[PDB]
Design a binder for this molecule. Structure first.
Ligand SMILES: Nc1ncnc2c1ncn2[C@@H]1O[C@H](COP(=O)(O)OP(=O)(O)O)[C@@H](O)[C@H]1O
Lengths: 24, 370, 402, 90, 29
């Protein structure tokens, strides 16, 4: 989108939410 | 109505603006002070002396850039009015103070005198018909769609967390430590002099800011990575001089987590948020483990989120769910949340009428914002 | 400005070009439009519409006389009445010189005050095409905005004072492409998830169009949850009628908007992070507000002895209606209605009661015929008066309890 | 350029004209005279603001004046706002 | 449900009425 174009940029190759290991 | 509200996204160092319902602020620029320093004989220079724009970002060797917002708390309110007049410039807004509603962004738990003086400005110098200031955390949840959460952020020398479910009154459940990147940049400059690179000017300091925010990360294993060997890759100045990586760009931002190295007993975001969890209630803390509303533009560095999750792993007990709000546009998201907030029905009652200022103002302002 | 203008026969001919197809039984120059714009006084009217700029229209009303075959004939004069006894079809003199030099229609117009109500036909023709021409004129880039706002406000007030129903339905146009996806995801993959749309995510203009459509639905929510009237216009029974009508109207609209296809499209827009429409749609909901309001009033807003008043030839049955009504009123503990609105309500009904008393007592000829008849009828009236009095007093006592 | 089109698109430019019979009984049927019960609307070849002012002044001044001096019910305010809009557009 | 002026019906009425509302009377121009 032009939203990310006209601005300095959003997240690069990394999401927002993460997750702990299985069976914490 | 053509009298569309005005969304003004402040910040200790950055500020944005626009109208209601807009999705991108068409005016984004910093927060500073500036005035020339030399003498011309031949005319043909720029006048006004307090510039904001390419000329300001070009004739840096002339102005004296300062920062009145001491941890956001501004002192040169008059100069801010000048800036706000620039906000109303011929290329900026062309509107008048008595023509539009104005929504303002803020940082909590500040003295009343701040809102007092601001009301004086926008109701006497400027004469705003509908003015309102609130917490960006609500706007953040609006921009993310969530309703309950632990909203944490970082400005430039300001950091604070708001763990609250749906805007419920929990003032005793709020934490704030205002310290961030500006002094880290000065600390970087300190490292520079430590290996022979002295800097002192305002513009010079801003270039250092660009260096910092341009080149910084977080090596997850401090001691371990320290034992290893670095790269010290060099970036180049406008002239083109040595800018090595050094221990700096990763060791210096860790001071935000080990604040005692600056010579100040503090706790570090992680412990701060943990205390905020302790400020909450056991019948809600599970949701709060899921409620991880992160924000802050200074936070956008490498080795940040996931390493901080490892910090949480060391802190939080078993069975915790990572649900981090983390696009890089969380700054803009505040502005956007306020824009949609402005585009509302009950919003009329939410603001402060101008006549209310004409009657009393102050106490009523504190009553409407609470 | 005209001197050797078109003849009165030519004047009636142009009047027939506009008036025979509407104010008459179709066709060319008939005798009706000829008598309308061809007589001596009509010749002076032709000179006033062609040789003068004052007459901005030539009122050719479609008068009719029934009780034979309504003689539907046009009459061209300066009497542009409303549609109350004739369909006023005026030859709008848009230009002063409507003569033989220029065209008889290009230098004019046909403004007609239709056979319907002036407010109804005015609001209908206004909102249909009058606001569109001036809207395009102003839309081509205020005084034009105030004129268009006046046209829209006039159509709104005209439809309000004209249409007493005033509660239409609400259109929810799902975008046809999305309906196509629903059909293709309706054959055996009956639930159209996000994945099927795919590249449709990058349609901020198209999804913005849909966002705007939802915004119109929001405007409709406002239209639904925007008004109630003073408990004095006509009988209060009319109000109770629209109370219940608006209750199931709200419920009907609710079931309409609860179509999971529309909701699903909103979910897609939600995925598109267009929180604007979603949240604003949720905030405009005066839905449960109004629903709960008429659900609150609803027990007393049901099964009221309304025809007992209109079905009481005797004062005894009048008293029966009085008792039945006041006893029916007692459902107040579950409604929470205003004191003033209740006063105005009972007072309007009481004036209606007096009107029914006029309807029953107006043919007694008390001062004309046998006096004892008046004695008996007035004794029954006394029964009505005191029953209204004391039972109303009991209502007052229950009001003290309220 | 002569561009006559029988549609519902009531557009108006600087010299765009039109010709319509906005049916009082909106369902234009062939079983009866669809042109009979129709409040006509014929936009002349003049300016749209002037055409709108002349049309408003010709269809709402004496009509709402007669419906205000007699008789739907909001003809006085309708005549006031209509005369104001007609004079304002003129 | 179907009381509508047909394509030829509405076309003929609009053609015979466009000239009366666009010129000095006459048939379909
Ligand atoms: N590349 C970057 N990575 C991380 N932070 C940055 C970068 N560039 C700028 N920043 C900092 O992010 C901050 C934006 O957070 P914000 O709350 O807007 O700060 P402020 O409150 O000072 O306006 C700015 O102060 C800026 O110094």
């Amino acid at each position: 989108d032009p939203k990310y174009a006209d601005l300095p940029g959003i997240a690069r190759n990394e999401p927002d939410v993460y997750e702990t290991s299985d069976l914490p | 109505i053509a009298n569309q509200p005005v969304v003004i996204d402040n910040g200790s160092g950055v500020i944005k603006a626009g109208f209601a319902g807009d999705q991108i602020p068409k005016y984004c620029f910093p927060n500073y002070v500036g005035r020339p320093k030399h003498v011309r004989v031949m005319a043909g220079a720029l006048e006004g002396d307090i510039f904001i724009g390419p000329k300001a970002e070009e004739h840096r060797g002339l102005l004296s850039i300062r920062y009145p917002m001491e941890h956001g708390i501004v002192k040169d309110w008059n100069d801010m009015e000048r800036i706000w007049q620039y906000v109303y410039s011929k290329d900026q807004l062309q509107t008048f103070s008595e023509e539009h509603p104005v929504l303002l962004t803020e940082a909590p738990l500040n003295p009343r005198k701040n809102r007092e003086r601001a009301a004086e400005v926008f109701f006497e110098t400027f004469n705003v018909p509908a003015l309102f200031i609130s917490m960006q955390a609500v706007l953040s949840l609006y921009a993310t769609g969530r309703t309950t959460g632990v909203v944490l952020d970082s400005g430039d020398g300001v950091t604070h967390a708001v763990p609250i479910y749906e805007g419920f009154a929990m003032p005793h459940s709020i934490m704030r430590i205002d310290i961030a990147g500006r002094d880290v940049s000065r600390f970087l400059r300190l490292y520079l002099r430590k290996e022979g690179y002295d800097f002192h000017s305002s513009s010079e300091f801003e270039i250092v800011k660009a260096i910092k925010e341009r080149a910084c990360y977080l090596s997850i294993n401090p001691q371990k990575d320290e034992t290893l060997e670095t790269e010290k890759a060099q970036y180049y100045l406008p002239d083109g001089s040595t800018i090595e990586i050094g221990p700096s760009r990763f060791r210096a931002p860790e001071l935000l987590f080990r604040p005692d190295l600056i010579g100040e007993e503090s706790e570090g975001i992680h412990e701060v948020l943990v205390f905020a969890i302790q400020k909450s209630d056991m019948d809600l803390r599970r949701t709060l483990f899921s409620n991880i509303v992160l924000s802050g533009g200074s936070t956008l560095f490498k080795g940040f989120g996931d390493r901080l999750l490892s910090e949480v792993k060391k802190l939080a007990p078993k069975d915790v769910k990572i649900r981090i709000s983390a696009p890089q546009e969380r700054l803009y998201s505040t502005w956007i949340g306020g824009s949609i907030l402005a585009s509302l029905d009950t919003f009329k009652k939410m603001w402060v009428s101008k006549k209310e200022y004409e009657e009393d103002g102050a106490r009523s302002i504190h009553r409407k914002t609470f | 400005a005209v001197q050797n203008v078109a003849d009165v026969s030519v004047l009636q001919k142009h009047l027939r070009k506009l008036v025979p197809l509407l104010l008459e039984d179709g066709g060319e120059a008939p005798a009706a439009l000829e008598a309308a714009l061809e007589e001596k006084s009509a010749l002076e009217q032709m000179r006033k519409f062609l040789s003068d700029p004052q007459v901005h229209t030539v009122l050719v009303e479609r008068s009719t006389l029934k009780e034979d075959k309504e003689f539907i004939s046009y009459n061209i004069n300066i009497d542009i009445h409303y549609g109350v006894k004739s369909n006023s079809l005026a030859f709008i003199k848009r230009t002063p010189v409507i003569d033989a030099d220029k065209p008889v229609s290009s230098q004019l117009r046909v403004l007609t005050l239709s056979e319907d109500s002036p407010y109804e036909t005015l609001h209908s023709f206004i909102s249909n095409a009058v606001a569109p021409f001036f809207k395009s004129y102003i839309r081509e880039s205020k005084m034009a905005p105030s004129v268009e706002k006046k046209i829209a406000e006039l159509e709104m007030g005209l439809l309000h004072l004209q249409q007493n129903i005033e509660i239409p339905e609400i259109s929810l146009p799902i975008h046809p492409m999305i309906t196509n996806v629903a059909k293709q995801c309706y054959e055996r993959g009956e639930k159209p998830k996000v994945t099927d749309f795919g590249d449709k995510v990058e349609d901020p203009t198209f999804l913005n169009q849909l966002q705007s459509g939802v915004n119109r639905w929001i405007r409709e929510i406002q239209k639904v949850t925007k008004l109630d009237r003073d408990p004095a216009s006509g009988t209060a029974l009319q109000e109770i009628s629209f109370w219940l009508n608006l209750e199931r109207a709200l419920y009907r609209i609710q079931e309409k908007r609860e179509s999971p296809e529309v909701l699903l499209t909103l979910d897609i827009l939600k995925h598109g992070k267009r929180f604007h429409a979603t949240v604003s749609f949720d905030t405009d909901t005066g839905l449960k507000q109004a629903l709960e309001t008429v659900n609150d009033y609803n027990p007393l807003m049901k099964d009221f002895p309304l025809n007992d008043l209109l079905s009481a030839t005797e004062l005894d049955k009048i008293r029966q209606a009085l008792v039945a009504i006041f006893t029916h009123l007692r459902k107040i503990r579950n409604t929470k209605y205003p004191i003033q609105r209740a006063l105005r309500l009972v007072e309007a009904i009481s004036r209606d009661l007096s009107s029914q008393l006029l309807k029953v007592l107006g043919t007694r000829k008390l001062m004309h015929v046998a006096y004892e008849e008046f004695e008996k009828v007035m004794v029954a009236c006394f029964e009505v008066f005191q029953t209204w009095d004391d039972e109303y007093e009991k209502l007052q006592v229950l009001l003290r309890d309220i | 350029f002569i561009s006559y089109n029988i549609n519902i698109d009531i557009h108006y430019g600087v010299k765009s004209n039109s010709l319509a019979f906005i049916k009082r009984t909106p369902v234009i049927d062939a079983d009866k005279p669809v042109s009979s019960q129709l409040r006509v609307l014929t936009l002349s070849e003049d300016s749209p603001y002037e055409t709108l002012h002349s049309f408003i002044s010709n269809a709402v001044a004496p009509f709402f004046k007669s419906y205000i001096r007699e008789s739907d019910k909001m003809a006085p305010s309708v005549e006031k706002k209509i005369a104001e809009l007609e004079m304002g557009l003129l």
